[PDB]
């Protein structure tokens, strides 16, 4: 469960979560998000980079512990 937070916090994205049909659905929803914001197809890797940037600027995950 840990070290998967660490990858998405050091870089902003987890590359192991997205493969195959899940990756394709991610890319389709990235299409929809770019269209709402105003972007176009560009390149799939550029879409993934925009996804990572949006995760960095928006995601704020909070995890609590006892001393």
């Amino acid at each position: 469960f840990l070290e998967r937070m660490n990858t998405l916090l050091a870089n902003g994205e987890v590359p192991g979560l997205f493969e195959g049909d899940e990756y394709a659905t991610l890319m389709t929803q990235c299409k929809e998000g770019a269209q709402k914001e105003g972007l176009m197809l560009d390149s799939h890797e550029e879409l993934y980079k925009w996804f990572t940037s949006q995760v960095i600027r928006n995601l704020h995950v909070v995890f609590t512990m006892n001393p």
Binding site: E3, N11, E19, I56
Partner: protein, 890 residues
């Protein structure tokens, strides 16, 4: 009769007749001892117990039924010979402990009681039960308890025992798990209660058949059957039903004497009285290792080998009575030939010290083996390898190769155990090619890593519903060798299991490494290992292997003292002088090796720096070959720099003086950055100070700035790293951005280091504290080059090689056109570098190993791997590995 037997055994006899002769000698020595001592001590009555105690045989051939022709009696117990065919079995020496065991067990059988020969391991308990059963002509089954136990077989085996009237002996009853122990104890209690009621005094005339409850049915019990439970206490159920016997100290001094007498040795008494305590000291004085075995089985193996050696010596002398041989010399030579190969280098002088103590004034001469020794010299010369005889440099390694070859002749199922850094792979490679060039028979070796692939992929799997068998890797190799579609017979095939061993993937191997040489597949197919196939186990520590696998293999221990550092320097210099890094380049390599020759000596700069760096503190465990190989690769990159500078300036190329200064300075730089290059700044400064103290080459004259922050320039002068770092002005929109890497003294140093170590394509790992900047320095440096692609893989705690296979499927492709299948990236001309951060993070299994790390080791050392789709060796090209991890102490 004994004199005739001893005269006959000395000659050449066929092996079956030899075994018959040995058995007759053993029995006649027992008979001679009995008659000479236990009967001639003033005994004149045939009913005296001094004679009734002995095992007496009575033959009545007028009886019609065959089972009643021969009656066997000992004390008051009466048995009828079952006349079961036993073939030819090993006959034990009838020691007085064996006589006591026979007496007690036959007394227990007469009272319809069980037998419990308890005692330590290796004292002869199971063998004594088997020998007693064979003496009465009964079929004896031994149920080994080494987790090779089950209920479905055992119940019907008990039923068959009760029906036919055979014997059942348990190897070690206490090792069974509690529930299985209780259930088997219940079954044995039922059978023994059936046996006890069979001899009821009021019901001696058994009219109704004696029957027991087994498998929820009524099973008739034969009166000739018996159950023997061997221990190391008895269950409460069977305490009142079994007679115990203490078999603690076997009479080794008598077993050895009788066995040596049976081998033709005339001084068997003295030789036994010297060899038994010698093995006692070897058990005691020598260091404790798992693979050592000084038990009675090993002692018998040594005596049999000594007899074979003596017979071979007699044959050699005859083809050139013959009694004046040095019997002690034959025995010591056999002991050494059997035990020295599996000895740690520290224990070798100890073994010869004990040999001198027990055997005074006798010396061991090893076989010269000059016929293959010259061939080994030639193969070592053509591999740029270091070769030596005896005390000169390389003697230990060549002797170890000879021991490996000897044990290869002796038996199959090899195991070469040595700490990483010893000459293990090279030893058997040189042996294979030397044998190929000598005997003219072509040698093919298959390298298999058992942990890079699963057990199902290694051995094959059976479809849960279809019942279709697809063979595994080892199974496919064995089937291909046996089928001989191409002619793999008349060719020495070596199945080398490079990697480590654990009790899992060798479960199906135990059936072939032993004398059976049979592989039993769960589908039903059986494969027989052909005589020209040898299986080797090139392992490192041998700390997680069962004694069952270890005892079935001839073994050579490759200590780190075998492969001296001078040998590494000689190999490196020869490869630099001969193998180009791609003629002018090779000329540059010759020059550079000439400059660096004085430093790569026995007591040179590099050796002293190495012996210092061991006592320092490093983040990872220092290995001699890791730092040595890094050093060599950095020197290759130096030769590459010299060639590049020469190409840049077609006129006025690198001169001898400038080249000498550059190579001296770079070798100092390479000692600094390869030795203690993975340590703290303080350790680096300390090593720099020590090197300044010892070396004579000039160093930077600044007393404040240490040499680690300096560099050597192409002109041959020390220059600071501070002068090469540029001043950057990143844009405002990219302030503290994820991909912004500001060049600094560290960044530029590690940048040049990374270029150096990816020039020759070594995989490297930047190990450091969290937040240091490994993951960013790596990406910047790799993406700086234009022919490099980077794939970032994040190794989790559950990472498996399947992730690497998926990465290869996604980014690379398989091509069949060249000699073998080659795995290459789809894009042409771009070297695929696999980022592997948290490389130390994946969990070790129950047996102290990492699956993905072993997989990477196989892909890096051998250049490829075996794919499980169709079991062929795919070769990697245009693929690199790069790692990064936090310190192991985290």
């Amino acid at each position: 009769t004994l004199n005739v037997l001893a005269d006959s055994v000395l000659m050449e006899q066929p092996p079956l007749r030899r075994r018959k002769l040995e058995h007759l000698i053993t029995e006649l020595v027992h008979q001679r001892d009995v008659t000479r001592s236990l009967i001639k001590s003033k005994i004149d009555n045939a009913k005296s117990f001094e004679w009734l105690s002995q095992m007496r045989f009575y033959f009545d051939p007028k009886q019609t039924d065959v089972l009643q022709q021969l009656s066997i009696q000992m004390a008051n117990a009466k048995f009828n010979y079952g006349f079961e065919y036993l073939g030819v079995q090993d006959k034990l020496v009838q020691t007085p402990l064996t006589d006591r065991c026979y007496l007690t067990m036959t007394q227990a059988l007469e009272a319809r009681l069980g037998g419990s020969p308890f005692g330590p391991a290796g004292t002869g308990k199971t063998e004594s039960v088997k020998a007693l059963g064979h003496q009465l002509g009964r079929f004896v089954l031994v149920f080994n308890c080494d987790e090779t136990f089950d209920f479905q077989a055992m119940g019907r085996i008990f039923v068959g025992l009760c029906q036919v009237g055979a014997w059942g002996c348990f190897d070690e009853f206490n090792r069974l798990e509690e529930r299985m122990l209780s259930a088997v104890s219940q079954q044995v209690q039922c059978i023994q209660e059936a046996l006890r009621e069979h001899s009821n005094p009021n019901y001696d005339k058994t009219s109704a058949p004696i029957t027991c409850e087994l498998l929820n049915k009524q099973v008739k019990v034969s009166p000739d059957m018996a159950i023997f439970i061997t221990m190391n206490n008895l269950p409460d159920n069977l305490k009142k039903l079994f007679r115990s016997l203490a078999m603690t100290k076997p009479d080794r001094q008598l077993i050895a004497q009788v066995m040596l007498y049976s081998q033709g040795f005339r001084t068997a008494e003295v030789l036994a009285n010297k060899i038994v305590p010698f093995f006692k000291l070897c058990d005691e004085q020598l260091s404790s290792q798992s693979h050592y075995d000084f038990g009675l089985r090993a002692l018998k193996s040594v005596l049999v080998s000594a007899g074979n050696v003596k017979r071979e010596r007699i044959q050699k002398i005859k083809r050139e009575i013959a009694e004046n041989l040095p019997e002690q010399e034959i025995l010591i030579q056999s002991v050494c030939e059997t035990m020295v190969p599996k000895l740690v280098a520290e224990d070798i002088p100890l073994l010869f010290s004990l040999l001198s103590d027990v055997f005074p004034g006798v010396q061991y001469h090893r076989g010269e083996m000059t016929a293959l020794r010259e061939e080994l010299k030639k193969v070592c010369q053509e591999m740029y390898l270091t070769y030596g005889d005896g005390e000169e440099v390389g003697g230990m390694w060549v002797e170890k190769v000879l021991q490996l070859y000897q044990i290869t002749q002796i038996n199959h199922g090899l195991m070469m155990v040595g700490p990483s850094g010893s000459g293990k792979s090279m030893a058997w490679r040189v042996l294979l090619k030397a044998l190929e060039r000598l005997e003219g028979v072509e040698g093919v070796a298959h390298i298999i890593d058992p942990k890079a692939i699963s057990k199902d992929h290694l051995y094959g799997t059976l479809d849960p519903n279809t019942r279709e068998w697809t063979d595994g890797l080892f199974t496919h190799v064995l089937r291909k060798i046996i089928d001989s579609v191409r002619g793999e017979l008349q060719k020495r095939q070596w199945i080398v299991f490079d990697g480590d061993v654990d009790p899992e993937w060798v479960e199906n191997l135990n059936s072939v490494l032993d004398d059976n040489k049979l592989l039993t597949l769960p589908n039903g197919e059986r494969l027989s290992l052909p005589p020209n196939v040898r299986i080797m186990f090139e392992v490192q520590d041998l700390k997680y292997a069962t004694l069952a696998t270890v005892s079935r293999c001839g073994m050579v221990w490759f200590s780190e003292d075998v492969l001296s550092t001078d040998m590494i320097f000689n190999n490196f210099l020869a490869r630099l002088r001969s193998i180009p890094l791609d003629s002018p380049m090779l000329q540059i390599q010759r020059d550079a090796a000439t400059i660096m020759q004085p430093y790569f000596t026995s007591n040179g700069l590099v050796t002293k720096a190495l012996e210092h760096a061991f006592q320092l503190e490093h983040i990872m465990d220092l290995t001699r070959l890791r730092c040595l190989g890094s050093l060599f690769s950095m020197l290759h990159q130096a030769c590459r720099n010299v060639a590049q500078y020469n190409a840049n300036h077609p006129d006025f190329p690198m001169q001898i003086e400038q080249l000498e200064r550059y190579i001296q300075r770079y070798l100092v730089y390479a000692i600094l950055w390869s030795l203690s290059g993975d340590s703290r700044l303080k350790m680096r400064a300390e090593l720099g100070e020590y090197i300044r103290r010892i070396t004579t080459v000039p160093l930077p004259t600044a007393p404040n700035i240490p040499i680690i922050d300096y560099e050597v320039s192409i002109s041959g002068e020390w220059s600071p790293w501070q002068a090469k770092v540029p001043q950057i002005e990143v844009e405002t929109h990219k302030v503290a951005a994820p991909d912004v890497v500001v060049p600094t003294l560290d960044t530029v140093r590690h940048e040049a280091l990374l270029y150096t170590w990816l020039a020759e394509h070594k995989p490297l790992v930047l190990c450091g504290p969290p937040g240091s900047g490994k993951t960013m320095t790596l990406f910047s440096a790799l993406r700086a080059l234009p022919d490099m692609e980077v794939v970032g893989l994040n190794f989790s705690s559950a990472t498996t090689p399947e992730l690497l296979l998926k990465t290869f499927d996604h980014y690379c492709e398989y091509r069949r056109t060249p000699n073998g299948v080659v795995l290459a990236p789809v894009q042409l001309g771009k070297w695929l570098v696999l980022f592997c951060d948290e490389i130390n993070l994946p969990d070790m299994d129950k047996y102290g190993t990492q699956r993905v790390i072993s997989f990477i080791r196989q892909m890096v050392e051998h250049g490829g791997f075996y794919r499980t789709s169709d079991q062929t060796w795919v070769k990697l090209e245009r693929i690199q590995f790069v790692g990064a991890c936090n310190p192991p102490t985290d």
